[PDB]
Ligand binder design. Structure first.
Ligand SMILES: OC[C@H]1O[C@@H](O[C@H]2[C@H](O)[C@H](O)[C@H](O[C@H]3[C@H](O)[C@@H](O)[C@H](O[C@H]4[C@H](O)[C@@H](O)[C@H](O[C@H]5[C@H](O)[C@H](O)[C@H](O[C@H]6[C@H](O)[C@@H](O)[C@H](O[C@H]7[C@H](O)[C@H](O)[C@H](O)O[C@@H]7CO)O[C@@H]6CO)O[C@@H]5CO)O[C@@H]4CO)O[C@@H]3CO)O[C@@H]2CO)[C@H](O)[C@@H](O)[C@@H]1O
Ligand SMILES: OC[C@H]1O[C@@H](O[C@H]2[C@H](O)[C@H](O)[C@H](O[C@H]3[C@H](O)[C@H](O)[C@H](O)O[C@@H]3CO)O[C@@H]2CO)[C@H](O)[C@@H](O)[C@@H]1O
Ligand code: NAG
Ligand code: CL
Ligand code: CL
Ligand code: CL
Ligand code: CL
Ligand code: CL
Ligand code: CL
Ligand code: CL
Ligand code: CL
Ligand code: CL
Ligand code: CL
Ligand code: CL
Ligand code: CL
Ligand code: CL
Ligand code: CL
Ligand code: CL
Ligand code: CL
Ligand code: CL
Ligand code: CU
Length: 235
Protein backbone atom coordinates (compact mmCIF):
# COMPACT_ATOMS: atom_id res chain seq x y z
CA UNK A 1 0.00 0.00 0.00
CA UNK A 2 1.80 3.05 -1.40
CA UNK A 3 1.20 6.12 -3.57
CA UNK A 4 3.28 8.79 -5.37
CA UNK A 5 3.59 12.16 -3.65
CA UNK A 6 5.31 13.99 -6.49
CA UNK A 7 8.46 14.08 -8.56
CA UNK A 8 11.86 15.68 -8.54
CA UNK A 9 13.68 16.89 -11.64
CA UNK A 10 17.52 16.96 -11.54
CA UNK A 11 17.29 16.79 -7.75
CA UNK A 12 14.81 19.64 -7.45
CA UNK A 13 11.44 18.92 -5.86
CA UNK A 14 8.56 19.85 -8.13
CA UNK A 15 6.08 20.12 -5.27
CA UNK A 16 3.12 17.99 -4.19
CA UNK A 17 1.70 16.51 -7.39
CA UNK A 18 -1.24 14.59 -6.01
CA UNK A 19 -4.24 15.23 -8.31
CA UNK A 20 -2.21 18.00 -9.89
CA UNK A 21 0.37 16.31 -12.19
CA UNK A 22 -0.15 12.79 -10.82
CA UNK A 23 -3.42 11.00 -11.86
CA UNK A 24 -3.79 9.93 -8.23
CA UNK A 25 -6.25 7.26 -7.06
CA UNK A 26 -8.20 8.06 -3.88
CA UNK A 27 -6.16 5.64 -1.73
CA UNK A 28 -3.21 3.31 -1.65
CA UNK A 29 -5.07 0.09 -2.34
CA UNK A 30 -3.54 -2.28 -4.88
CA UNK A 31 -4.84 -3.12 -8.31
CA UNK A 32 -4.96 -6.92 -8.86
CA UNK A 33 -7.21 -7.59 -11.83
CA UNK A 34 -4.93 -7.97 -14.83
CA UNK A 35 -7.75 -7.41 -17.32
CA UNK A 36 -9.09 -4.24 -15.71
CA UNK A 37 -8.79 -0.77 -17.12
CA UNK A 38 -7.38 0.10 -13.73
CA UNK A 39 -4.08 -1.47 -14.90
CA UNK A 40 -3.49 1.53 -17.21
CA UNK A 41 -3.21 4.36 -14.65
CA UNK A 42 -5.02 3.03 -11.56
CA UNK A 43 -8.62 3.63 -10.60
CA UNK A 44 -9.05 7.35 -11.34
CA UNK A 45 -7.47 7.86 -14.74
CA UNK A 46 -8.30 11.36 -15.91
CA UNK A 47 -6.43 14.44 -17.11
CA UNK A 48 -5.12 16.42 -14.22
CA UNK A 49 -4.36 20.14 -14.57
CA UNK A 50 -0.56 20.29 -14.73
CA UNK A 51 2.31 18.52 -16.56
CA UNK A 52 5.89 18.71 -15.24
CA UNK A 53 8.40 20.15 -17.74
CA UNK A 54 11.58 18.24 -18.36
CA UNK A 55 14.22 17.99 -21.14
CA UNK A 56 15.86 14.90 -22.56
CA UNK A 57 18.75 13.81 -20.27
CA UNK A 58 17.16 15.11 -17.12
CA UNK A 59 16.73 12.81 -14.13
CA UNK A 60 13.03 12.37 -13.23
CA UNK A 61 12.52 10.94 -9.71
CA UNK A 62 9.23 9.48 -8.48
CA UNK A 63 8.65 9.77 -4.72
CA UNK A 64 6.39 7.23 -3.01
CA UNK A 65 4.87 7.17 0.48
CA UNK A 66 2.54 5.03 2.56
CA UNK A 67 0.37 7.26 4.74
CA UNK A 68 2.36 10.49 5.00
CA UNK A 69 5.34 11.83 3.09
CA UNK A 70 8.75 10.17 3.85
CA UNK A 71 7.31 7.59 6.18
CA UNK A 72 7.84 3.82 5.96
CA UNK A 73 7.09 4.10 2.24
CA UNK A 74 5.62 0.57 1.75
CA UNK A 75 5.34 -2.41 4.04
CA UNK A 76 8.53 -4.48 4.04
CA UNK A 77 6.53 -7.60 3.29
CA UNK A 78 5.83 -6.27 -0.22
CA UNK A 79 8.93 -7.59 -1.90
CA UNK A 80 8.92 -7.34 -5.62
CA UNK A 81 10.14 -5.50 -8.74
CA UNK A 82 9.76 -1.89 -9.96
CA UNK A 83 9.29 -0.71 -13.52
CA UNK A 84 8.70 2.54 -15.37
CA UNK A 85 6.93 2.85 -18.69
CA UNK A 86 6.25 5.85 -21.03
CA UNK A 87 3.47 6.49 -23.51
CA UNK A 88 2.44 9.59 -25.53
CA UNK A 89 -0.32 11.47 -23.75
CA UNK A 90 -2.55 11.41 -26.88
CA UNK A 91 -3.04 7.68 -26.28
CA UNK A 92 -4.57 8.21 -22.84
CA UNK A 93 -2.61 5.00 -22.22
CA UNK A 94 -4.83 2.91 -24.62
CA UNK A 95 -3.61 0.66 -27.39
CA UNK A 96 -0.14 -0.69 -27.93
CA UNK A 97 1.71 2.21 -26.53
CA UNK A 98 3.60 1.62 -23.23
CA UNK A 99 7.40 1.38 -23.65
CA UNK A 100 9.58 0.19 -20.74
CA UNK A 101 12.27 2.60 -19.59
CA UNK A 102 13.39 0.86 -16.41
CA UNK A 103 13.29 -2.51 -14.66
CA UNK A 104 14.76 -3.59 -11.28
CA UNK A 105 13.82 -6.89 -9.72
CA UNK A 106 16.26 -8.68 -7.50
CA UNK A 107 19.88 -7.56 -6.88
CA UNK A 108 22.04 -10.67 -6.19
CA UNK A 109 24.95 -8.71 -4.78
CA UNK A 110 23.02 -6.69 -2.24
CA UNK A 111 20.48 -9.60 -1.72
CA UNK A 112 17.59 -7.09 -2.05
CA UNK A 113 14.44 -6.67 -3.94
CA UNK A 114 13.71 -3.41 -5.70
CA UNK A 115 11.04 -2.61 -3.07
CA UNK A 116 13.50 -3.20 -0.24
CA UNK A 117 15.84 -0.62 -1.90
CA UNK A 118 12.99 1.77 -2.44
CA UNK A 119 12.29 1.91 1.29
CA UNK A 120 16.02 2.60 1.98
CA UNK A 121 15.75 5.35 -0.72
CA UNK A 122 12.92 7.18 1.15
CA UNK A 123 10.59 6.25 -1.67
CA UNK A 124 12.65 7.62 -4.48
CA UNK A 125 13.49 6.03 -7.82
CA UNK A 126 14.50 7.70 -11.09
CA UNK A 127 14.71 7.46 -14.85
CA UNK A 128 16.76 9.55 -17.24
CA UNK A 129 14.37 11.19 -19.77
CA UNK A 130 14.93 9.71 -23.23
CA UNK A 131 15.55 11.59 -26.57
CA UNK A 132 12.01 11.17 -27.76
CA UNK A 133 9.75 13.68 -29.75
CA UNK A 134 8.98 16.75 -27.66
CA UNK A 135 5.44 16.68 -26.45
CA UNK A 136 3.19 15.50 -23.64
CA UNK A 137 3.71 12.07 -22.07
CA UNK A 138 2.50 9.79 -19.35
CA UNK A 139 5.13 8.13 -17.18
CA UNK A 140 3.69 4.98 -15.51
CA UNK A 141 5.58 3.81 -12.42
CA UNK A 142 4.68 0.32 -11.28
CA UNK A 143 5.56 -1.59 -8.15
CA UNK A 144 4.57 -5.28 -8.08
CA UNK A 145 4.29 -6.66 -4.56
CA UNK A 146 4.65 -10.45 -4.57
CA UNK A 147 3.79 -11.42 -1.00
CA UNK A 148 0.54 -13.14 -2.16
CA UNK A 149 1.65 -13.88 -5.73
CA UNK A 150 1.78 -17.63 -5.24
CA UNK A 151 -1.88 -17.46 -6.18
CA UNK A 152 -3.53 -15.93 -9.22
CA UNK A 153 -6.17 -13.24 -8.66
CA UNK A 154 -8.18 -14.67 -11.54
CA UNK A 155 -8.51 -17.92 -9.58
CA UNK A 156 -8.52 -16.62 -5.96
CA UNK A 157 -9.50 -12.97 -5.76
CA UNK A 158 -8.35 -12.64 -2.14
CA UNK A 159 -4.77 -13.24 -3.20
CA UNK A 160 -2.58 -12.45 -6.25
CA UNK A 161 0.22 -10.16 -7.27
CA UNK A 162 -0.45 -6.54 -6.28
CA UNK A 163 0.19 -3.58 -8.57
CA UNK A 164 0.78 -0.13 -7.25
CA UNK A 165 0.49 2.00 -10.44
CA UNK A 166 0.98 5.74 -10.73
CA UNK A 167 0.89 7.89 -13.90
CA UNK A 168 2.67 11.28 -14.02
CA UNK A 169 1.99 13.91 -16.67
CA UNK A 170 5.34 14.99 -18.02
CA UNK A 171 6.03 17.43 -20.82
CA UNK A 172 9.27 16.97 -22.67
CA UNK A 173 10.42 20.31 -23.95
CA UNK A 174 14.00 20.13 -25.29
CA UNK A 175 14.94 16.94 -27.11
CA UNK A 176 16.41 16.33 -30.44
CA UNK A 177 14.13 13.24 -31.10
CA UNK A 178 17.18 11.15 -31.92
CA UNK A 179 15.52 8.05 -30.37
CA UNK A 180 11.95 8.21 -31.45
CA UNK A 181 9.58 6.16 -29.38
CA UNK A 182 9.08 2.49 -30.59
CA UNK A 183 6.20 0.17 -30.37
CA UNK A 184 4.88 -0.52 -26.97
CA UNK A 185 2.56 -2.86 -25.09
CA UNK A 186 -0.98 -2.50 -23.75
CA UNK A 187 -2.02 -2.08 -20.19
CA UNK A 188 -4.26 -3.92 -19.48
CA UNK A 189 -3.07 -6.72 -21.72
CA UNK A 190 0.68 -7.22 -21.44
CA UNK A 191 0.42 -9.12 -18.20
CA UNK A 192 -1.53 -12.36 -18.18
CA UNK A 193 -1.71 -15.33 -15.78
CA UNK A 194 1.06 -17.14 -17.70
CA UNK A 195 3.37 -14.17 -17.93
CA UNK A 196 6.76 -14.74 -16.21
CA UNK A 197 6.93 -12.99 -12.82
CA UNK A 198 3.15 -12.69 -12.18
CA UNK A 199 2.76 -15.93 -10.31
CA UNK A 200 5.78 -16.72 -8.18
CA UNK A 201 6.47 -17.96 -4.64
CA UNK A 202 9.03 -15.71 -2.98
CA UNK A 203 9.12 -17.92 0.10
CA UNK A 204 10.24 -21.15 -1.62
CA UNK A 205 11.72 -20.18 -4.93
CA UNK A 206 15.16 -18.49 -4.84
CA UNK A 207 14.92 -14.85 -5.68
CA UNK A 208 17.85 -15.37 -8.11
CA UNK A 209 15.28 -17.38 -10.21
CA UNK A 210 12.76 -14.56 -10.50
CA UNK A 211 12.19 -13.15 -13.94
CA UNK A 212 10.25 -9.88 -14.11
CA UNK A 213 7.31 -9.61 -16.53
CA UNK A 214 8.30 -8.59 -20.06
CA UNK A 215 8.52 -6.37 -22.04
CA UNK A 216 12.26 -5.96 -21.93
CA UNK A 217 13.55 -2.42 -21.33
CA UNK A 218 13.81 -0.43 -24.61
CA UNK A 219 17.45 -0.11 -25.97
CA UNK A 220 16.83 3.67 -26.35
CA UNK A 221 16.15 4.08 -22.63
CA UNK A 222 18.82 5.97 -20.65
CA UNK A 223 18.51 3.98 -17.48
CA UNK A 224 17.64 4.82 -13.94
CA UNK A 225 18.12 3.89 -10.31
CA UNK A 226 16.53 3.31 -6.97
CA UNK A 227 18.21 5.91 -4.78
CA UNK A 228 17.45 8.96 -2.71
CA UNK A 229 18.10 12.26 -4.75
CA UNK A 230 16.58 14.74 -2.30
CA UNK A 231 15.78 15.20 1.40
CA UNK A 232 12.11 15.83 1.88
CA UNK A 233 12.54 16.76 5.53
CA UNK A 234 14.50 19.96 4.38
CA UNK A 235 11.49 21.80 3.18
O1 LIG B 1 9.72 -20.43 8.38
C1 LIG B 1 10.33 -20.56 7.09
C2 LIG B 1 9.30 -20.98 6.05
O2 LIG B 1 8.78 -19.84 5.42
C3 LIG B 1 7.67 -20.15 4.61
O3 LIG B 1 7.01 -19.02 4.01
C4 LIG B 1 5.89 -18.47 4.77
C5 LIG B 1 6.46 -17.16 5.33
O4 LIG B 1 7.33 -17.50 6.43
C6 LIG B 1 5.39 -16.06 5.61
O5 LIG B 1 4.86 -16.14 6.95
C7 LIG B 1 4.29 -16.05 4.49
O6 LIG B 1 3.12 -15.29 4.81
C8 LIG B 1 2.75 -14.15 4.03
C9 LIG B 1 1.22 -14.31 3.56
O7 LIG B 1 1.15 -15.30 2.43
C10 LIG B 1 0.63 -12.98 3.10
O8 LIG B 1 -0.79 -13.12 2.94
C11 LIG B 1 0.93 -11.87 4.10
O9 LIG B 1 0.27 -10.65 3.72
C12 LIG B 1 0.10 -9.56 4.66
C13 LIG B 1 1.28 -8.53 4.49
O10 LIG B 1 2.49 -9.10 4.99
C14 LIG B 1 1.00 -7.28 5.19
O11 LIG B 1 1.99 -6.27 4.80
C15 LIG B 1 -0.41 -6.77 4.88
O12 LIG B 1 -0.72 -5.57 5.53
C16 LIG B 1 -1.70 -4.69 4.93
C17 LIG B 1 -3.00 -4.83 5.69
O13 LIG B 1 -3.56 -6.12 5.27
C18 LIG B 1 -3.98 -3.72 5.35
O14 LIG B 1 -4.41 -3.94 4.04
C19 LIG B 1 -3.29 -2.35 5.44
O15 LIG B 1 -4.21 -1.38 4.92
C20 LIG B 1 -4.10 -0.11 5.60
C21 LIG B 1 -3.16 0.83 4.81
O16 LIG B 1 -1.80 0.28 4.81
C22 LIG B 1 -3.15 2.17 5.42
O17 LIG B 1 -2.42 3.05 4.61
C23 LIG B 1 -4.57 2.70 5.60
O18 LIG B 1 -4.35 3.92 6.34
C24 LIG B 1 -5.42 4.89 6.26
C25 LIG B 1 -6.30 4.85 7.54
O19 LIG B 1 -7.01 3.60 7.63
C26 LIG B 1 -7.26 6.06 7.52
O20 LIG B 1 -8.09 5.98 6.36
C27 LIG B 1 -6.44 7.35 7.45
O21 LIG B 1 -7.22 8.54 7.51
O22 LIG B 1 -5.80 7.36 6.17
C28 LIG B 1 -4.81 6.31 6.04
C29 LIG B 1 -4.14 6.54 4.67
O23 LIG B 1 -3.26 7.66 4.78
O24 LIG B 1 -5.35 1.78 6.37
C30 LIG B 1 -5.47 0.52 5.74
C31 LIG B 1 -6.39 -0.37 6.55
O25 LIG B 1 -6.15 -0.18 7.95
O26 LIG B 1 -2.10 -2.31 4.64
C32 LIG B 1 -1.13 -3.26 5.07
C33 LIG B 1 0.10 -3.02 4.25
O27 LIG B 1 0.56 -1.71 4.50
O28 LIG B 1 -1.38 -7.75 5.21
C34 LIG B 1 -1.26 -8.90 4.43
C35 LIG B 1 -2.40 -9.87 4.77
O29 LIG B 1 -3.65 -9.19 4.85
O30 LIG B 1 2.33 -11.69 4.23
C36 LIG B 1 2.96 -12.83 4.90
C37 LIG B 1 4.45 -12.54 5.11
O31 LIG B 1 4.65 -11.27 5.67
O32 LIG B 1 3.75 -17.31 4.10
C38 LIG B 1 4.72 -18.31 3.75
C39 LIG B 1 3.93 -19.58 3.50
O33 LIG B 1 3.32 -19.96 4.73
C40 LIG B 1 8.10 -21.11 3.44
O34 LIG B 1 6.94 -21.56 2.75
C41 LIG B 1 8.89 -22.32 3.98
O35 LIG B 1 9.55 -22.98 2.88
C42 LIG B 1 9.92 -21.89 5.01
O36 LIG B 1 10.47 -23.06 5.66
O1 LIG C 1 14.26 20.59 -16.48
C1 LIG C 1 13.59 21.02 -17.69
C2 LIG C 1 12.59 22.13 -17.42
O2 LIG C 1 13.05 22.93 -16.30
C3 LIG C 1 12.04 23.90 -15.88
O3 LIG C 1 12.32 24.80 -14.71
C4 LIG C 1 12.02 24.20 -13.46
C5 LIG C 1 13.34 24.48 -12.72
O4 LIG C 1 14.39 23.84 -13.52
C6 LIG C 1 13.13 23.96 -11.29
O5 LIG C 1 12.80 22.61 -11.24
C7 LIG C 1 11.88 24.61 -10.73
O6 LIG C 1 11.67 24.03 -9.44
C8 LIG C 1 10.89 24.79 -8.52
C9 LIG C 1 9.59 24.01 -8.22
O7 LIG C 1 8.81 23.87 -9.42
C10 LIG C 1 8.77 24.77 -7.19
O8 LIG C 1 8.53 26.09 -7.69
C11 LIG C 1 9.55 24.89 -5.86
O9 LIG C 1 8.86 25.70 -4.92
O10 LIG C 1 10.81 25.54 -6.15
C12 LIG C 1 11.64 24.97 -7.20
C13 LIG C 1 12.95 25.79 -7.24
O11 LIG C 1 13.65 25.42 -6.03
O12 LIG C 1 10.68 24.47 -11.50
C14 LIG C 1 10.78 24.85 -12.87
C15 LIG C 1 9.58 24.36 -13.68
O13 LIG C 1 8.36 24.62 -12.99
C16 LIG C 1 11.75 24.91 -17.05
O14 LIG C 1 10.66 25.75 -16.68
C17 LIG C 1 11.40 24.17 -18.38
O15 LIG C 1 11.41 25.12 -19.48
C18 LIG C 1 12.41 23.04 -18.66
O16 LIG C 1 11.95 22.24 -19.79
C1 NAG D 1 -11.69 -7.91 -13.91
O1 NAG D 1 -11.88 -6.79 -14.76
C2 NAG D 1 -12.76 -7.13 -15.84
C3 NAG D 1 -12.53 -6.04 -16.85
O2 NAG D 1 -13.25 -4.80 -16.52
C4 NAG D 1 -14.21 -7.25 -15.30
O3 NAG D 1 -15.12 -7.67 -16.32
C5 NAG D 1 -14.15 -8.40 -14.27
O4 NAG D 1 -15.39 -8.64 -13.71
C6 NAG D 1 -13.05 -8.16 -13.19
N1 NAG D 1 -12.92 -9.22 -12.20
C7 NAG D 1 -13.37 -9.03 -10.93
C8 NAG D 1 -13.17 -10.23 -10.05
O5 NAG D 1 -13.92 -7.97 -10.55
CL1 CL E 1 -1.69 -6.67 1.45
CL1 CL F 1 -11.59 1.93 -2.21
CL1 CL G 1 -8.22 -5.12 -8.59
CL1 CL H 1 1.28 22.63 -16.72
CL1 CL I 1 20.59 10.17 -12.67
CL1 CL J 1 5.32 -5.59 6.88
CL1 CL K 1 1.75 -1.61 7.16
CL1 CL L 1 0.50 13.20 -27.30
CL1 CL M 1 -0.56 15.05 -26.84
CL1 CL N 1 16.83 -0.67 -15.93
CL1 CL O 1 19.35 5.51 -1.02
CL1 CL P 1 8.85 10.14 -30.12
CL1 CL Q 1 -13.58 -17.72 -6.10
CL1 CL R 1 -6.32 -7.94 -20.76
CL1 CL S 1 14.27 -9.86 -14.21
CL1 CL T 1 14.19 -2.40 -27.79
CL1 CL U 1 18.80 7.77 -12.56
CU1 CU V 1 -0.01 -3.20 0.63
Amino acid sequence: HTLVWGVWVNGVDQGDGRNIYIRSPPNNNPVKNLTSPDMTCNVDNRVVPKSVPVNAGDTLTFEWYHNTRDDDIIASSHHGPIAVYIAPAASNGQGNVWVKLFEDAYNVTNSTWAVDRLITAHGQHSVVVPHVAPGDYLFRAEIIALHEADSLYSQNPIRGAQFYISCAQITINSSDDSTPLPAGVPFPGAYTDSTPGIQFNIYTTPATSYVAPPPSVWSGALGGSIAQVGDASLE
